[PDB]
Amino acid sequence: MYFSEQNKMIRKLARDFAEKELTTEILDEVEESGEFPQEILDKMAKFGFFGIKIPKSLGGSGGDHMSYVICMEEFARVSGVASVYLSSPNSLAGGPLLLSGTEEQIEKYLKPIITGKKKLAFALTEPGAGSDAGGMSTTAVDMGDYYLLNGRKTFITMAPLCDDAVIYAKTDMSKGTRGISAFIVDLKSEGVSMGKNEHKMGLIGCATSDIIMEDVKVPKENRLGEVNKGFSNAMKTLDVGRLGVASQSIGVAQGALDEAIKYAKERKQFGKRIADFQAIAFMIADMATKLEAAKLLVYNAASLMDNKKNATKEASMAKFYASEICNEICAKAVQIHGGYGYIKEYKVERMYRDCRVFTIYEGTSQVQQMVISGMLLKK
Amino acid sequence: EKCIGCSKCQKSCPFDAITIENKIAVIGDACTNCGTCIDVCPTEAILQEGTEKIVRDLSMYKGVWVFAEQREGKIMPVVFELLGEGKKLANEIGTELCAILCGSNVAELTDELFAYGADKVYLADAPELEKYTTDGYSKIINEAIGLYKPEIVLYGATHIGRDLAPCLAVKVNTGLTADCTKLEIDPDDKKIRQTRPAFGGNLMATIVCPGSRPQMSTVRPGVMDKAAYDPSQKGEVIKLDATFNEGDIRTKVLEIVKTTTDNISISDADFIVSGGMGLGKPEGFELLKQLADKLGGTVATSRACVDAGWADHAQQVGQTGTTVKPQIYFACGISGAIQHIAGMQDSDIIIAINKNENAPIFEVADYGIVGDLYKVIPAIIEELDKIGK
Amino acid sequence: MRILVCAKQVPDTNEVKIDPKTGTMIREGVPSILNPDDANALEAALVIKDENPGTEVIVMTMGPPQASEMLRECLAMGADEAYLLSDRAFGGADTWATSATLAAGIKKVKKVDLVLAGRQAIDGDTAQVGSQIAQRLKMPVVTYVEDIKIEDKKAIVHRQMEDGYEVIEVQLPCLLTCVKELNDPRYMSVGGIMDAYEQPITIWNHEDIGLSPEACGLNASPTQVFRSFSPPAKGGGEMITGTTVNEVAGSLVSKLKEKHII
Ligand SMILES: Cc1cc2nc3c(=O)[nH]c(=O)nc-3n(C[C@H](O)[C@H](O)[C@H](O)COP(=O)(O)OP(=O)(O)OC[C@H]3O[C@@H](n4cnc5c(N)ncnc54)[C@H](O)[C@@H]3O)c2cc1C
Ligand SMILES: Cc1cc2nc3c(=O)[nH]c(=O)nc-3n(C[C@H](O)[C@H](O)[C@H](O)COP(=O)(O)OP(=O)(O)OC[C@H]3O[C@@H](n4cnc5c(N)ncnc54)[C@H](O)[C@@H]3O)c2cc1C
Ligand SMILES: Cc1cc2nc3c(=O)[nH]c(=O)nc-3n(C[C@H](O)[C@H](O)[C@H](O)COP(=O)(O)OP(=O)(O)OC[C@H]3O[C@@H](n4cnc5c(N)ncnc54)[C@H](O)[C@@H]3O)c2cc1C
Ligand code: SF4
Ligand code: SF4
């Protein structure tokens, strides 16, 4: 779109930073030892990347959505897992706090994660409930002085590293999608237990496991907003989160392309260089135009959010198209690198593996199509 | 007439003073009709003048002056170069080649600097100039301007001269150039054509000072060469005063240190000696370590050695390794895969040493030598010191 | 305390290396960055601010309105007040005029105890302006700063020499030019940027700073650039021959010296 002069500066910051602090030496160590260095996280919160769109009124940074997408893109370009550690407090953890949270809860909960002292997990997915989050099975019972919960959450990002976790349980089992409340649970409490870290294909550096809740008591003073609102809470958080996922799609995309034209300029085979063979140069073109076309897709979505019009469709398109053509791009970049793009030392293979969940998690491409077509066909 | 002598108007004049030839606003040979002193006087003092500049000449005296770096009272080799082509400078326009030396009790360097080609030499043996100081020589060389005003004043691009030169220029209100490359004199207009590289070395510029006497320039170490030594021509050792004050030198030195910097990153270096599978044994790097030491840079490696165990990955260069843009690169016993050539293509100059002539590296080799490096490498170090580095 | 830093916006000399084989390399639109050594100086002052509270930092510069943006970067790093010098006459001036108008622009602010600059800027490569501002203002000057530590009234510092360094004591006020070896400048903040763009920038002129209308910039310029050309490429990658092992080395080293820094 068009970038505000402050957002151009932020772009400059996230560039020099993400490029400078995420060295080859480190990122290799993250894949081998699935542990992101706490020192870097602290370093990020110190300059506020953990607080981009939250305003100074609550002790944030006072940026706009476009600044969140800009930082998301420019980070994810260099490393995927970095992006994961970035989106959580900006969007998935700091979302429902920012919407359905009393002033006390925000004082005791949000500012810690913006400054990097506390870590917060957004926990919705169950073994029986994936795309159909409305078909949850975790229960939440009102006992008066506290709430009692009994359930199980799979695929919970960062959870073993998290201190509290926003967990969605079914309060009114009859109302279904109308009867879900949202609670803040201290993961250190009773009954709560974690599953094994899951061995995933990519995005290695951030642990991901199950949250098991066994007769865990949660005080009433730690419930998110109104009772039976939890579902709308999670949707309206999910829109900005999906903007996040499309944002990292576009990041790692632009990156794998940059590595693409670099290798294609440098490698020679028939006396010509690779990039002077028509098949390749056209292929580069094709990738470039999709990437831009759709950069414009997602930029537009975020600008809508910033000007307060509903972005529920526009974001869904952004996540869908961005992640899909990201995968197409990542693959093609392998193919330009040729054989060498299959060895782990060439950065393009880590990308190719990373960019695959992008079409699954945060709502599959199918769920995206369901939202969009369902929005265009109502009569 | 009624200049009330408010003293508020002293430093805005661009040559800082004109004041105390016994008195403030007793001005003279430096009014440039600037317009700073228009209204700054409370009662609008001097008010009609100003469209006149100072172009009043007789501005052509002689002087081709070489400063002598005197580290611990020893001529630094840089002066032998500055005396080398600076004597050439003096000859073309026609003038003696004067020299200035400021030290503590320097006695023999007088005869050295006389012998190396200089006609006239100036000396300041004041034990107050034992160590290096920016105001001491500032004031001491500024003193040699009002009396022996020269036309050309040269300096060394060493960390001493590059600090003395700008400070000396601002007070005499002349022009200066940065670390220069080569110089001359335009034969009919008597002036100096100063040339140097700027823009990181991408745009050369011949900067000249027409309304500035003297003409001064810090000159780079190594561009010229030595002059003839010990004709023992003459000498006219001339005296200056060394009239220090009661705290007329605010820079005071506690300690001087001489370090031996051995840690140096392959990315930060200015000279690189890289070695590949053409070493056979891991011990080859000693040779290249010998090479790198006379130059002051580090040893790099290719993947073949790392995956063989001869070195660590921190050293490797190429697409998987690390990219280098040195001032020199030594391609020693490396096949030359693009996997390497990629990460050093922009080295300012690439020198190759391979056994087989059918190695690709000779495609970007600026200079190539075919052979076994274990024989070629030591011979390169031999002729290295034989000229003086 | 008041600490004034002289920062310059410059073209990124790192990337602008290449040119057509038929071309004087002046590009279309080159990125303008904060001169690295100035970033080091500004960082030093930001650490004095970090250690001595209530110390305000004034950053100043001279050039075009485009330089304004770089000042914003400085403010996003943590600077307090920014000042810009722009005039039709200022442009196209040598180090003497540049230093004169810079110090003159300094004279009209809240009197500073410490003034910081960089060793040199990557676009002119002169390393002169700082010392000329220092001595033009009758102050001490200490260049090549490698470690700076002020002892509550006067300054003790390191001076990076080719073989070592010189620990030096200097009385404040003073000017000392910084070099990149001494510190790792800090990044900006997302909040630093937003707060930076709202703080207003005060912009002066040749009739605003109480200066020479007549003789600044190009008018009072002792040194004047005349020729502007490119340096030639060598191209010929022709080898070195010889009879003897040492015979080859001689031609290699000798050619390597002639027209070279050897
Ligand atoms: C797991 C594995 C096992 C292997 N085993 C063997 C083995 O047993 N034996 C063996 O000999 N090799 C083996 N190889 C090597 C492999 O077969 C070759 O590398 C393959 O032919 C590609 O080589 P390359 O990457 O160097 O091609 P590159 O030339 O480096 O790649 C060039 C890229 O651009 C394209 N391209 C190339 N030329 C042109 C052109 N003129 N116009 C347009 N596009 C062009 C190509 O499709 C390719 O994507 C193996 C490789 C792998 C990954
Ligand atoms: C995924 C991947 C990434 C890679 N990344 C890199 C990378 O970043 N950088 C890199 O350099 N390589 C890299 N490689 C390896 C690269 O392709 C080559 O294998 C490597 O350059 C070979 O080592 P060498 O260059 O020293 O040449 P070699 O072939 O190993 O060296 C032999 C050469 O030395 C000559 N020679 C032999 N003995 C002597 C002697 N006594 N005196 C003089 N010359 C002698 C021979 O005639 C021949 O010219 C990578 C490989 C892969 C698969
Ligand atoms: C190719 C070329 C060659 C030149 N040659 C000469 C020459 O031989 N002699 C000469 O006198 N002039 C010369 N000039 C002009 C001179 O560069 C100008 O005065 C220029 O504005 C200052 O750049 P510099 O290289 O002198 O800066 P430097 O002296 O390298 O800079 C030193 C410090 O000065 C400070 N500084 C300088 N200007 C500003 C500013 N506007 N705002 C803030 N801080 C500032 C910075 O902090 C910097 O760290 C040349 C210019 C060009 C383009
Ligand atoms: S300004 Fe007017 S009053 Fe002040 S000193 Fe110069 S002349 Fe005397
Ligand atoms: S105008 Fe002439 S007199 Fe007034 S200050 Fe400038 S130089 Fe000195």
Short recap of the structure:
This is part of a larger assembly, with chains A (379 residues), B (389 residues) and C (262 residues). With 379 residues, chain A is an alpha+beta fold.
CATH architecture of the largest domain in chain A: Up-down Bundle
The biggest sheet of chain C, with number of strands, parallel, antiparallel or mixed sense and barrel status, is: 6 strands, parallel
Class derived from helix and strand content of chain C = alpha/beta
Largest sheet of chain A: 4 strands, mixed
- The Cα radius of gyration of chain A reads 21 Å
Identify every distinct bound molecule in the structure, by name, code or SMILES.
flavin-adenine dinucleotide, iron/sulfur cluster
Number of strands of chain A: 8
Work out the helix count of chain C. 6
Instruction: Quickly count the domains of chain C.
Output: 1
Quaternary assembly: part of a larger assembly
PDB class: flavoprotein
Keywords: Acetogenic bacteria, bioenergetics, flavin-based electron bifurcation, electron-transfer protein/acyl-CoA dehydrogenase, ferredoxin, flavoprotein
Entry title: Molecular basis of the flavin-based electron-bifurcating caffeyl-CoA reductase reaction
Chain A: Caffeyl-CoA reductase-Etf complex subunit CarC
What does this structure look like?
The structure is cut from a larger assembly and holds chains A (379 residues), B (389 residues) and C (262 residues). Chain A is an alpha+beta fold and 379 residues long. Chain A contains twelve helices and eight strands. Chain A has three domains: 119 residues, Acyl-CoA dehydrogenase/oxidase, N-terminal domain (Butyryl-Coa Dehydrogenase, subunit A, domain 1, Orthogonal Bundle), CATH 1.10.540.10; 118 residues, Butyryl-CoA Dehydrogenase, subunit A, domain 2 (Beta Barrel); 142 residues, Butyryl-CoA Dehydrogenase, subunit A, domain 3. In chain A, the strands form two sheets. Chain A has a four-stranded mixed beta sheet with strand order 1-4-5-8. In chain A, strand 2 and strand 3 form a beta hairpin. Chain A is globular and about 80 Å long. Chain A starts with a helix and ends with a helix. With 389 residues, chain B is of the alpha/beta class. In chain B, helix 1 links the parallel strand 1 and strand 2. The radius of gyration of chain B is 27 Å and the shape is elongated. In chain C, a hairpin with a 2-residue loop joins strand 8 and strand 9. Chain C starts with a strand and ends in a 5-residue tail after the last helix. Helices cover 27% and strands 25% of the residues of chain C. Chain C has a six-stranded parallel beta sheet with strand order 10-6-1-4-5-11, sandwiched between helices. A three-stranded antiparallel beta sheet of chain C has the order 7-8-9, with no helix packed on it. Chain C has a two-stranded antiparallel sheet with strand order 2-3. Chain C has a single domain, classed as 3-Layer(aba) Sandwich (Rossmann fold), CATH 3.40.50.620. The chains are: A alpha+beta (379), B alpha/beta (389), C alpha/beta (262). Chains A and B meet through loops of A and loops of B. Strand 10 of chain B pairs antiparallel with strand 9 of chain C, so a sheet runs across the interface. The structure holds flavin-adenine dinucleotide (FAD) (3 copies) and iron/sulfur cluster (2 copies). The site of one iron/sulfur cluster (SF4) has 11 residues of chain B, from loops. It is classed as flavoprotein.
